[PDB]
Design a protein around this nucleic acid. Structure first.
Ligand SMILES: [Mg+2]
Ligand SMILES: [Mg+2]
Ligand SMILES: [Mg+2]
Ligand SMILES: [Mg+2]
Ligand SMILES: [Mg+2]
Ligand SMILES: [Mg+2]
Ligand SMILES: [Mg+2]
Ligand SMILES: [Mg+2]
Ligand SMILES: [Mg+2]
Ligand SMILES: [Mg+2]
Ligand SMILES: [Mg+2]
Ligand SMILES: [Mg+2]
Ligand SMILES: [Mg+2]
Ligand SMILES: [Mg+2]
Ligand SMILES: [Mg+2]
Ligand SMILES: [Mg+2]
Ligand SMILES: [Mg+2]
Ligand SMILES: [Mg+2]
Ligand SMILES: [Mg+2]
Ligand SMILES: [Mg+2]
Ligand SMILES: [Mg+2]
Ligand SMILES: [Mg+2]
Ligand SMILES: [Mg+2]
Lengths: 55, 117, 152
RNA sequence: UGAGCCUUGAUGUGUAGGAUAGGUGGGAGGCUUUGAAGUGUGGACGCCAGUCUGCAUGGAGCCGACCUUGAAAUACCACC
RNA sequence: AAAAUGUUCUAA
RNA sequence: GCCCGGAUAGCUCAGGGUAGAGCAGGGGAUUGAAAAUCCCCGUGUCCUUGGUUCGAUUCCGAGUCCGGGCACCA
RNA sequence: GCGGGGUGGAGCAGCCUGGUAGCUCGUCGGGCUCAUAACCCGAAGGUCGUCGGUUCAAAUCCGGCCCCCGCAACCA
RNA sequence: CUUGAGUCUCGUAGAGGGGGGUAGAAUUCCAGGUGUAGCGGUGAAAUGCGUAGAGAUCUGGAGGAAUACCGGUGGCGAAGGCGGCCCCCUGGACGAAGACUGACGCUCAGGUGCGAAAGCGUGGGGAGCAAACAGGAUUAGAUACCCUGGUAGUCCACGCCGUAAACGAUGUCGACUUGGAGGUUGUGCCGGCGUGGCUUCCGGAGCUAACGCGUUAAGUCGACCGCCUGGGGAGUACGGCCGCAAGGUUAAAACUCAAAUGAAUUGACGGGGGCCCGCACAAGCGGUGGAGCAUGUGGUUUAAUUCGAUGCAACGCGA
């Protein structure tokens, strides 16, 4: 999420772009998913449940 | 001592505490402040306000040095993840490059077992 | 309540000053449903305050009131067994009522001879930011500013 | 990089007050266009009360003792 | 956040 | 016996020009109890005496007690 | 033969240093609960193994006895 | 004889397997620079790290393990399982045209082999994680959950073990029987029209106790195999075989009960989810519990202290 503030760019919209960039990059989601170890069977079950719910 | 005017802010914001250190572009630390030292302990150490207070009392820690071009390098999924930049701006630093350097393993080491709460 | 259909109740103004605020003061100081006794006590205390202050008989009351009004309160909210007391703003009518109740209960917790003397002393002391009602205001403000982190 | 020594430059705002004044002092006039009260810029310290300033512009003034301090103004000047 | 248990038969 | 340190609150510790920094205790607050944290409150010849300057714990003198090192230890 | 101990109902302090009997559990009374346990608020509960002596005063200090823990009991 | 089965020709996709090498991110440690008073953790704390300079930030180095994004009810494999990139060796599957052999097939007791994880032996390795273990909390207790550490183990080579909710709880092979929407792989003709393979969801007839299955059948049939005969005792004892051991496999009986069970229905309940309400909270005012007296009750007492009510919904109640 490296962003340089544009020429004469206001600060608030600059970090709004920062938040949008980090949300697009999924930093917080990756960190949340890597806080604890999910057993491979648990990961497969969660993926299957998400697929079923989405379908 | 020597003014720098082109420092960088490292915001290690975790789920329990926020550590903000103003360093030089060479990585050499100039000042630091924590939410746990700003005057908060426990459920208040981890509030977005505490990180704001820590950032604003870290800004005035680095006064003998340069002020002009501080840039933010926030890291960690902390509650005080954006209020620190708010406080830094309110203190009078213009942020050129704001970036995220949160360490993401590319697999890496096995994480700790999940809490059964 | 859950219905939240409550509105407002009209309070007749004070006969001697035509002020609804002072009518509310007389009404709060009431004990066991005695409008006349509370009105007499309030009138005597206000006369003493006006004599010893020289501002007015209603403006001096408002000056004393302003120095004891709270600008922020705190409301409890449990999260994980422990309490998370969050600061909230106080509506002007509620802050008037709170300051007035604090003044009355501080006057009751005194040691003067009559209630008129107690209340007049309390308003005079509050106008100088030295009474115990002002102390309660200060404590409320300090304790609502201590946990300002919870004011999301 | 300390320790010690010898010299320079200021430091040390109880309480009054014009005064970020410890003691002591030959003794109360030098300084000045050998560019001076008023200065912009830059630096030191500061419990930020008040001192020093490299130079510019600027032009030539600054003025000690006298009065409230326990003490007297770095106007010249000596020892801690 | 902590939050254990409910004598035997009968179920009107 | 000499040298090096001191004697400050219910308790631990600073500081010629101010008696203080914190911890206990009481109370208010939240809260089921215990909490952390928030706020209010005091707790003194600064060991005794003598000189000091516009006063003194602050510079010093004579002592008492409280801790270390060394010496005599026949 | 030597040493230690005996203190509410239980287990431990107070004994050195004579004048100041405490902690936890248990019990009682009231709370919470639909009740019981837990928890919360109050209270009672040991003149100290017994006897003798000193002392103004003894659980304490000193002697005798009783009970209980250890320790010792070796050379033939 | 060629239609079942197989061989040859070209091509396609794939985390299929074995071996070797390498890359980046990150976590740990080591050193060094800056810097100062907290880090860490929790529901809150504390143990634990830190003024011997931690945490944070930057630089260099060491080592181990796993491969973010791609990533997909996607793909491959008989099953277990398989996920960075490259190379070497290698198994299978599928498609389009043909040519070839000519029943060479299907199933399979015993037998043999493969077989997650944990575990075992020998020799290495050890970053992270983490049985056992220690400490701090929590609690009435807490040999747990939570926190701080942490050893086997997890990793590699070889050799054992041979079990799992080893599951699609659905043996293998073949034939037949309306459809819809996809996914992923080939393919012809001309962006569409067809055609095969594997796979996901829904659903018709039919089947089923029902739930549901439904061309990938739990439908209609055929071949062979394995297995069941009430619940406990018990997948246990004894014996046999296997194993270094843990144990695995084969596998009873006496005794005892009148049930055990599967699916679904109606309620009830949930420290399950919603949408609401009530002096139920919140906001307030006044009380009770303390005192004296009145009254009722329990208990006690007495010759009797009549009987009844005795959670809310008995106790100034019948009275
Ligand atoms: Mg953790
Ligand atoms: Mg139960
Ligand atoms: Mg039962
Ligand atoms: Mg009781
Ligand atoms: Mg397949
Ligand atoms: Mg067989
Ligand atoms: Mg294994
Ligand atoms: Mg080994
Ligand atoms: Mg333990
Ligand atoms: Mg653990
Ligand atoms: Mg091994
Ligand atoms: Mg089996
Ligand atoms: Mg099976
Ligand atoms: Mg179906
Ligand atoms: Mg069937
Ligand atoms: Mg049977
Ligand atoms: Mg067996
Ligand atoms: Mg056997
Ligand atoms: Mg059922
Ligand atoms: Mg209420
Ligand atoms: Mg009463
Ligand atoms: Mg009766
Ligand atoms: Mg009857």
């Amino acid at each position: 999420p490296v962003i340089k503030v544009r020429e004469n760019e206001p600060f608030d919209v600059a970090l709004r772009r920062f938040k949008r960039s980090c949300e697009k990059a999924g930093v917080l989601a990756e960190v949340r998913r890597r806080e604890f170890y999910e057993k491979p069977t648990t990961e497969r079950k969660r993926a299957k449940a998400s697929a079923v719910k989405r379908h | 001592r020597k003014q720098v005017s082109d420092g960088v802010a490292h915001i290690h914001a975790s789920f329990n505490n926020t550590i903000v250190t103003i360093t030089d572009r060479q990585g050499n630390a100039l000042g630091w402040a924590t939410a746990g030292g700003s005057g908060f302990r426990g459920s208040r150490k981890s509030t977005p306000f505490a990180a704001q207070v820590a950032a604003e009392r870290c800004a005035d820690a680095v006064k003998e040095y340069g002020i002009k071009n501080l840039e933010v390098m926030v890291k960690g999924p902390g509650p005080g993840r954006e209020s620190t930049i708010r406080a830094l701006n309110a203190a009078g630093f213009r942020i050129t490059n704001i970036t995220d350097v949160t360490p993401i393993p590319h697999x890496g080491c096995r994480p700790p077992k999940k809490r059964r709460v | 309540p859950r219905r939240r259909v409550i509105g407002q109740r009209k309070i007749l103004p004070d006969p001697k000053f035509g002020s609804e605020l002072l009518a509310k003061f007389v009404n709060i100081l009431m004990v066991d449903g005695k409008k006349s006794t509370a009105e007499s006590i309030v009138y005597s205390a206000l006369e003493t305050l006006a004599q010893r202050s020289g501002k007015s008989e209603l403006e001096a009351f408002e000056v004393a009131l302003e120095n004891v009004r709270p600008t922020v309160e705190v409301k409890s909210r449990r999260v994980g067994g422990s309490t998370y007391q969050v600061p909230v703003e106080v509506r002007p009518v509620r802050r008037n009522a709170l300051a007035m109740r604090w003044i009355v209960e501080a006057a009751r917790k005194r040691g003067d001879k009559s209630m008129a003397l107690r209340l007049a002393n309390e308003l005079s002391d509050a106008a100088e930011n030295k009474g115990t009602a002002v102390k309660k205001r200060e404590d409320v403000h300090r304790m609502a500013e201590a946990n300002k982190a919870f004011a999301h």
